[PDB]
Design a protein around this ligand. Structure first.
Ligand code: JHZ
Ligand code: SAH
Ligand code: ZN
Length: 405
């Protein structure tokens, strides 16, 4: 039995996705076929309702000099983060000498807008290659993990932060209590800790199990974040649902009683209770649906091959590691994966070892079918790939059901 990382309660497993590789490691084709693996399974705390993985991957195996994800690769996301930055500039950063800290700034997708406004800021980016990309834009970055001690160090030299922000980053820190202690040492008394991550309600509704992989330790809900904040002296004071990344919620935490929660918080809590979101039975039914999507997806991919149809994948997502390894999908069923990230191209995907090629290579003559791993980017991608569909090529999606369009 494993102990909850928020509260120490007991975690009950409901989904076992078996042995899995590191999702963001892309090997050269000549590399030894050895990879770190771990058991990926998900459970729910008995006491605080936090849904979480049962085995942690050590941080330094995932996040380091060669981490390959570049935030600024999506036009939708560049606009999404510039707007959030302007919203903070108009609201929480209007003081004399305001200060914003971002946890997980990556290539500077959000902080560039802050820097261009002349506002004091600091990004934490322990993956040094993407940290350098942010520093080239004139952003101030420290190549360290955010945790209690590094937060203390920033408080000592820079003073309190008006906003601490994290997007797609808090989800992967199992040492969330250390981060909370850091936020407590660093945040201004009237500041906010704002984070946005994949939402449990969307995952259950869409059967989007590919959101579950080594860099998604927590599947947060308003119910579990409310408990986590409270147990640490914060309070959930606003929630906003976001369409990005398959469905997210942005959570705003303030010191307890310092601000009054928006009506939005109670509304979302009540909908999660009515829908029995976090009940073990609902979560087990989700797990049953995961197996049905596996079985349908592999039946389709095998019938396509029996029918002489060509199949590739589009987007070398981290998420796709779960799909290929749980369903047993490799290059005999999906020949190549197309992707815009230079450091993933001319490499093999983890576990399944499908070759990754540049997206500029997806061109006439097109394959019959493209398995859309980057399904969270469907509008942006399909807008760029109208010629493929006009030519008769079709997309295979597995969210929220296996279907072709
Ligand atoms: C828009 C676009 C993307 N692409 C390619 C680029 C990417 O490799 C991938 C998309 O990856 P995308 O769904 O954004 O994240 P991933 O699941 O990897 O997940 C990563 C890792 C991480 C931090 N743990 C996380 O949660 C999210 C934020 O990021 O697809 C195109 O080829 N053409 C395009 O037009
Ligand atoms: N403890 C921690 N502190 C700060 N950054 C962290 C961290 N653990 C991991 N990271 C960083 O978290 C980032 C997640 S990538 C996504 C980042 C970006 N905010 C976006 O939303 O697109 C990686 O760049 C990784 O190095
Ligand atoms: Zn718990």
């Amino acid at each position: 039995p494993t102990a909850c990382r928020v509260c120490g309660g007991g975690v009950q497993e409901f989904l076992d996705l078996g042995r899995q590789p590191l999702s963001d490691r892309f090997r050269k084709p000549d590399e030894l076929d050895d990879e770190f693996t771990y058991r990926l399974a998900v459970g729910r705390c008995d006491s605080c309702e936090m849904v979480q993985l049962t085995e942690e991957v050590p941080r330094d195996l995932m996040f380091h000099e060669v981490y390959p994800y570049h935030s600024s690769g999506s036009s939708v996301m560049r606009e999404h983060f510039a707007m959030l930055a302007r919203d903070f500039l108009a609201t929480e950063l209007t003081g004399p000498d305001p200060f914003i800290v971002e946890i997980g700034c990556n290539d500077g997708i959000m902080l560039r807008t802050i820097q261009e406004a002349g506002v004091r800021h600091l990004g934490f980016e322990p993956s040094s290659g993407v940290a350098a990309k942010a520093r080239e834009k004139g952003i101030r970055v420290r190549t360290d993990f955010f945790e209690k001690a590094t937060a203390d160090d920033v408080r000592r030299t820079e003073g309190p932060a008006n906003v601490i922000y994290a997007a797609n980053t808090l989800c992967h820190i199992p040492y969330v209590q250390s981060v909370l202690e850091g936020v407590d040492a660093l945040l201004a008394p009237d500041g906010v800790f704002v984070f946005e991550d994949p939402y449990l309600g969307d995952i259950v509704a869409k059967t989007s199990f590919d959101q579950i992989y080594d860099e998604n330790f927590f599947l947060f809900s308003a119910t579990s974040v409310q408990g986590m904040a409270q147990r640490c002296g914060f309070e959930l004071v606003d929630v906003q649902r976001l369409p990005v990344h398959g469905g997210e919620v942005r959570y705003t935490l303030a010191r307890q009683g310092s601000r009054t929660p928006s009506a939005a918080v109670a509304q979302l809590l009540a909908a999660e209770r009515e829908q029995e979101l976090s009940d073990m039975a609902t979560l087990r039914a989700f797990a049953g649906n995961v197996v049905k999507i596996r079985d349908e997806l592999t039946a389709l991919l095998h019938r396509l091959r029996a029918e002489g149809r060509s199949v590739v994948g589009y987007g070398a997502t981290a998420k796709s590691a779960t799909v290929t390894n749980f369903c047993g999908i490799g290059p005999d069923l999906v020949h190549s994966v197309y992707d815009t990230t230079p450091d993933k191209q001319n490499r093999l995907t983890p576990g399944a070892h499908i070759p990754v090629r540049p997206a500029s290579a997806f061109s006439d003559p097109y394959p019959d079918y493209a398995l859309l791993f980057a399904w969270n980017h469907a509008e942006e991608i399909m807008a760029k790939e109208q010629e493929f569909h006009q030519a008769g090529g079709r997309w295979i999606l597995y969210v929220p059901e296996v279907h072709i369009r």
